[PDB]
């Protein structure tokens, strides 16, 4: 039974600050904190294949390592499947022989879980392709869990991870779809990845998509 | 690991150097002040005593205040660590009825909160003015020398402070003359289980007032006067309420569920006398000629704990306490420049000021308000120059000139009266008007030659006032005999108002100080 | 670590060697005395007992005082560890009314003043009341037969002239007539008025209605009654006496955790007062306004170890810290007034002690050795203005003819209707009234008011000055001036030279009353 | 919440004594206690240069190791700058090829902090010159902190450490003053030293002269 004083110390600890690194510094620090959640297991493998992590300000489109590449891809969708204009976002991975990730800097990266979730999502892509696309085959290991989600009571799991397409594909999943569509199959991996990583969105995955979590849990730790 | 000597929750370094509270992403943030950043956002720079849990010596901590974790009824201005949060309750009488213990009298009363040329008193008081207009008193009541008068009235408690009151009401003394205590007014039930928040009445204006000796009640102690007292009451048409400072316990904030309950271990009685000894008091009748008292945390050089407070200037106090502001270098209160207000000090505070001015090589105070330091126990009074004040610091007069400008703007002149737009702050120092008709050689005839027939003025939902000539001219419009010679009208100031016939028993209007506000020959003009 | 024997918050070495509380960067700081730093800042050098949580044996610790962590109503001077902080409450009567126990009643204004005892201690404070004997016979106007019985009533206020406040309690007071005729016992109603009587304040405050013995609104109140004989004595003396005890209730204490100052139910004035009185030297000083102001300073008691652990205290020092004296240029004085303008009076024992010190000092004049004279617990010193003449209660009742005239030496606007002049408040106290006689050119005199009770012509004017009114007792008419040649004289009477009753003869004349010439003008342009 | 008995034991421990070494012994013991506050770091360096510590009684002037040397220096000022007659004091250091310190013996060396402070002061001199005067140069290290005291808000620091001279020297301090006046510059070092050493006068230094303390703190421990 915490006394009133004890409660005061708790809230003051949350509310009272002293030394401040200044806007700019905080921005950088915030970003760093995000990566700390991501297991270095993948980070090292990103730089290994020539991976660059940038934390620019303002519009991302307005960057040096990234100029005006295909205005088409500047139309995007968030981790929820809703559209968005790249110049207004805060994160993006780059598909090329020289893979590179760049993000905006904000105080919100410690307040807004939505943002972090979307950046872990992008990282999910990087892995699902820029690190998995290589020696994916036989690939059946993950292929089999994706099926359980398609055919099973409760659409939730596939309303959470699947696009407005795979859901409506009547037939069960052919072990050829992954070939024709390595794109979609890795978006899923990216999403499930984001949710598992984002600490608060983790249990959500364990609940709505027990299998996707059941796998992503084993996957990393071993 | 960071020094928080007073345990209020704000590190010492911040209280002394300057801090502010900001909300970013719906989260509270208390951090050091940074002009370029915070000024933009219109935030407030706070300074406070690192060795006082409550700088103003009130029941709320500096942290609770600036952060909002407090009784929501604590006035906005009192959310500033340097502005004291305490109740200022006084009694308001609306109507009064006198009878012989029909044949009774019912008059409307105008009670106003007063201020003491005296020092402290640990009490607030108000003066009641009884309507002397038409409906003789003792006569109408048929009071023989051996009689005895009964008294009763309707009242409301009003809190003009910065903190609320719970479940308790102050004891009030009804005084006649200098020290004739007629009655002692206490609250019934001992626990009404109500609340009197700052800036509110109790009971609220939409409810029935409180009556001394209620109808439904029968055991209530009747208020009685003797023949002589009644005579004085009629001679003066004025009473006085002396209300104490027993405000009961304080509603405190709880850090577990945000609940605000009355702390039985926290009492206004033990905190008030500390506020009064550590704060500078400023009284200001600028909002509506009503005396509003505020207290600011000011340093006391001889007291270490107190010299640990932020330095406070006269200009600053006015900003944070009464909401003054300097839009373009000019300190003002809602368009009204400081130069429109007088400064009045008690003896000691006055002497202090002089020494500051002298040491400042300044003569005009209005040009140095940001340099004038405040000290605990200072008493400052700020009034509108436009008016004359009495002993209680109430607007009861003004110079002839200012009144005229107010009346100068006429809107329509007939013989049924006068219609014009006049400031509300003027209608406060005026008891009524008297109108005479002057000949071409100087023959003047007052159309209402009684001291209690000046109430011809009447308000209006329009917002403008209309002087009625019919009222005391036997319902009929002003009959002009010759449109050549003029009709004169002039107002009577409250300090020059007469409520009882002369020693002669004379009811005439003559002798009464009046102030010209009209004159037209009568023809087309009139 | 560092020794704090009494656990007051101050190390031992500091209390004995000297210390002070300074504020740097809006942060309190308790530091050893450092002349080159602290004298500049006008700070005060403190010394106190390391073995007394409260060197003055009062409810406040040496630390709480010097630091400000204390009830803010504790007088500034009592923030010094060597100056005791305690209440000194006495009752002040303003007006009195006497009637025949069921007009014809009497209403007189009363002037009560706090007194001091040639006696030792008494654990009580007292005041004497003086009833106005001016015009409005008493028993006559009241029609009191030998078998009658008089009723009494009055308006009073409690006044605290001490250094500490009082809460929720008022002392019991005895109304005494003669030597020991206890007329009434005055207690506070409700048992708990829930108010405060701070030092230097009245209760109720002067802006509020006074307290009445047997209030109008109250009916059960016990009426105060005198018999025919008592009333006669009351009229013969025109004087009563209030004996107020020292039941001051509980003490408001400071609470560090939140700085709250609540009344400690476990702390009572009754258990602390008798310790103050046995460890302190008492100095009484009527220098501020001829009003007796009592103060107590912590003085050593050689026979008592705990007490000999206190700082050494000299007469000069006590005066500085207690009554705010000062020596601007070597000269000890109280607001321009040099010490040599004041008398010293001691009780027996303290007097003997002083003599031994002076003797051992090879000094005869005390005024030249105040910094060498040691104070001891239980000393009683009385310091009064030489100019004035005091009664047996040490109350200014008069002065020297020369000084009186000096005050009226400043006329303003003379007329035939009355005189007006700004007059020193100090003297007004010792004055009962004035008399004005018309003198012929050959030496005849015709006093305009030839009664002992027609002196009340002086009246304070809110402008800040006094106005004498000839009209008052001249049938509301201006003083008639037959011949502007022979002068019309005017002069006041001292309170000790004041007569309150008709002489043995029944003579009501003004003659016989010792007076002091303060005005005389031929009458013409001069008059 | 200490019971009444517990408080009694506390005070009795302060008040009640038993075995007594006798006046003379106590005198010596007292002196010793003082030195114990001084870090041996300097003591060894004093005897190293031929340093002798004496604890005589009565007038110091009346000594063997010190006879009648220059009656002029028998006029002195305390750590506060107030004059004093040597024959009435209780401490003094000796400037010569054979440096030597001698002090009076008293019970006050455990009661009076004023005295101890004045003796630590003298020791301060011994160091500032008889141990520093040697390899002082470049000496800029301390020279720079002394400046901050001269020019800065709050005169206190220089009202505490500076003489009635350096305070009034309008111009900032020339890096030549230390040469012309190694005397004054070392008096300061002596004073600041005394305050830092005297345990109770330490915080005082930290407050009124934060820099002087900030340095003297580092100085010794490293
Ligand atoms: Ca704090
Ligand atoms: Ca604070
Ligand atoms: Ca102590
Ligand atoms: Ca002590």
UniProtKB/Swiss-Prot annotation, chains A, D:
Changing residue 123 to A: Loss of ability to bind to PA. Residues 1-222 are annotated as: I. Residues 9-221 form the ATLF-like domain. It is found in: Secreted; Host cytoplasm, Host cytosol. Changing residue 161 to A: No effect on PA-binding ability and fully toxic. Induction: Positively transcriptionally regulated by AtxA, which, in turn, is induced by bicarbonate and high temperatures (37 degrees Celsius). Changing residue 119 to A: No effect on PA-binding ability. Changing residue 160 to A: No effect on PA-binding ability and fully toxic. Lethal factor (LF) is composed of four domains: domain I contains the first ATLF domain that binds the membrane-translocating component protective antigen (PA); domains II, III and IV together create a long deep groove that holds the 16-residue N-terminal tail of MAPKK before cleavage. Domain IV contains the catalytic center. Interacts (via ATLF domain 1) with the cleaved form of protective antigen (PA-63) anthrax toxin; interaction is required for LF translocation into the host cytoplasm. Interacts with PA-63 homooligomers (either homoheptamers or homooctamers): three molecules of LF bind the PA-63 homoheptamer to form the PA(7)LF(3) complex, in which the relative position of the N-terminal alpha-helices in the three LFs determines which factor is translocated first. Lethal factor (LF), which constitutes one of the three proteins composing the anthrax toxin, is able to trigger rapid cell death in macrophages. Acts as a protease that cleaves the N-terminal of most dual specificity mitogen-activated protein kinase kinases (MAPKKs or MAP2Ks) (except for MAP2K5): cleavage invariably occurs within the N-terminal proline-rich region preceding the kinase domain, thus disrupting a sequence involved in directing specific protein-protein interactions necessary for the assembly of signaling complexes. This is Lethal factor. The gene is lef. The chain holds residues 62 to 283 of 809 of the full protein.
From Swiss-Prot, chain B:
The record marks 5, 14, 63, 255 as: Alpha-clamp. Changing residue 29 to A: Loss of ability to bind to LF and completely non-toxic. Residues 86-278 are annotated as: Domain 2, membrane insertion and heptamerization. Changing residue 470 to A: No effect on toxicity. Residues 279-386 are annotated as: Domain 3, heptamerization. Residues 29-37 are annotated as: Alpha-clamp. Changing residue 322 to L: In Sverdlovsk sample. The record marks 474 as: Essential for binding to cell receptor. Changing residue 202 to C: Loss of capability to undergo conformational changes that lead to pore formation and translocation. It comes from the Bacteria. Ca(2+) 2 binds at residues 6, 8, 15, 49, 52, 62. Residues 100-120 are annotated as: Disordered. Changing residue 477 to A: Great decrease in toxicity due to decrease in cell binding. Homooligomer; homooligomerizes to form homoheptamers (PA-63(7)) or homooctamers (PA-63(8)). PA-63(7) or PA-63(8) form ring-shaped oligomers that are in a pre-pore conformation, which do not penetrate the host membrane. PA-63(8) displays an enhanced stability, suggesting that this form circulates in the blood to reach and exert toxicity even in distant tissues. Interacts with lethal factor (LF) and edema factor (EF); can bind LF and EF simultaneously and interaction takes place following homooligomerization on the host cell membrane. This is Protective antigen PA-63. It comes from Bacillus anthracis.
């Amino acid at each position: 039974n915490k006394t009133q004083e004890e409660h005061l110390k708790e809230i003051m600890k949350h509310i009272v600050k002293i030394e401040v690194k200044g806007e700019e510094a905080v921005k950088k620090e915030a970003a760093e904190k995000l990566l700390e959640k991501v297991p270095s297991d993948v980070l090292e493998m990103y730089k290994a294949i020539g991976g660059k992590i940038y934390i620019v300000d303002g519009d991302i489109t307005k960057h040096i390592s990234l100029e005006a590449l295909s205005e088409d891809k500047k139309k995007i969708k968030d981790i929820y499947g809703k559209d968005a204009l790249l110049h207004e976002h805060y994160v993006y991975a780059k598909e090329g022989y020289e893979p590179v990730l760049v993000i905006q800097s904000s105080e919100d990266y410690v307040e807004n879980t939505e943002k972090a979730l979307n950046v872990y999502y992008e990282i999910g892509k990087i892995l699902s392709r820029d690190i998995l696309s290589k020696i994916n085959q036989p690939y059946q290991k993950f292929l089999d869990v994706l099926n359980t989600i398609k055919n099973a009571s409760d659409s939730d799991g596939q309303d959470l991870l699947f696009t407005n397409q795979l859901k409506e594909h009547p037939t069960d999943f052919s072990v050829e779809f992954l070939e024709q569509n390595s794109n979609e199959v890795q978006e899923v991996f990216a999403k499930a990845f984001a949710y598992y990583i984002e600490p608060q969105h983790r249990d959500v995955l364990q609940l709505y998509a027990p299998e996707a979590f059941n796998y992503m849990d084993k996957f990393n730790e071993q | 690991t960071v020094p928080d000597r007073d345990n209020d929750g704000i590190p010492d370094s911040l209280e002394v150097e300057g801090y502010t509270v900001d909300v970013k992403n719906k989260r509270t943030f208390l951090s050091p002040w940074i002009s370029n950043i915070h000024e933009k956002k219109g935030l407030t720079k706070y300074k406070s005593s690192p060795e006082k849990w409550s700088t103003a010596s009130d029941p709320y901590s500096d942290f609770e205040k600036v952060t909002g974790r407090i009784d929501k009824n604590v006035s906005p201005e009192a959310r500033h660590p340097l502005v004291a949060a305490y109740p200022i309750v006084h009694v308001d009488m609306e109507n009064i009825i006198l009878s012989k213990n029909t044949r009774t009298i019912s008059k409307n009363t105008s009670t106003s909160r007063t201020h003491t040329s005296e020092p402290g008193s640990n009490s607030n008081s108000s003066t009641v003015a009884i309507d002397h207009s038409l409906s003789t008193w003792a006569e109408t009541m048929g009071l023989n020398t051996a009689d005895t008068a009964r008294l009763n009235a309707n009242i409301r408690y009003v809190n003009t402070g910065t903190a609320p009151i719970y479940n308790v009401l102050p004891t009030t003394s009804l005084v006649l003359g200098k020290n004739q205590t007629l009655a002692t007014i206490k609250a019934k039930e001992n626990q009404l289980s109500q609340i009197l928040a700052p800036n509110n009445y109790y009971p609220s204006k939409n409810l029935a007032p409180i009556a001394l000796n209620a109808q439904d009640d029968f055991s209530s102690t009747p208020i009685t006067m003797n023949y002589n007292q009644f005579l004085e009451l009629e001679k003066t048409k004025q009473l006085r309420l002396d209300t104490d400072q027993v405000y009961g316990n304080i509603a405190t904030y709880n850090f577990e569920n945000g609940r605000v309950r009355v702390d039985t271990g926290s009492n206004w009685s033990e905190v008030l006398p500390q506020i009064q000894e550590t704060t500078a008091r400023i009284i200001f009748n600028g909002k509506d000629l009503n005396l509003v008292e505020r207290r600011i945390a000011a340093v006391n050089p001889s007291d270490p704990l107190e010299t640990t407070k932020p330095d406070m200037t006269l200009k600053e106090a006015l900003k944070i306490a009464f909401g003054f502001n300097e839009p373009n270098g000019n300190l003002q209160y809602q368009g009204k420049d400081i130069t429109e207000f007088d400064f009045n000090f008690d003896q000691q505070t006055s002497q202090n000021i002089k020494n500051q001015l002298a040491e400042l090589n300044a003569t005009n105070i209005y040009t140095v308000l940001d340099k004038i330091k405040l000290n605990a126990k200072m008493n400052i009074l700020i009034r509108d120059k436009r008016f004359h004040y009495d002993r209680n610091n109430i607007a009861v007069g003004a110079d002839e000139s200012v009144v005229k400008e107010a009346h100068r703007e006429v809107i329509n002149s007939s013989t049924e009266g006068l219609l014009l737009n006049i400031d509300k702050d003027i209608r406060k120092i005026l008891s009524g008007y008297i109108v005479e008709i002057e000949d071409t050689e100087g023959l003047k005839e007052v159309i209402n030659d009684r001291y209690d027939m000046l109430n011809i003025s009447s308000l209006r939902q329009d917002g403008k006032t209309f002087i009625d000539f019919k009222k005391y001219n036997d319902k009929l419009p002003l009959y002009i005999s010759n449109p050549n010679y003029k009709v004169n009208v002039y107002a009577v100031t409250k300090e020059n108002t007469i409520i009882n016939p002369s020693e002669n028993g004379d009811t005439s209007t003559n002798g009464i100080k009046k102030i010209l506000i009209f004159s037209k020959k009568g023809y087309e003009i009139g």
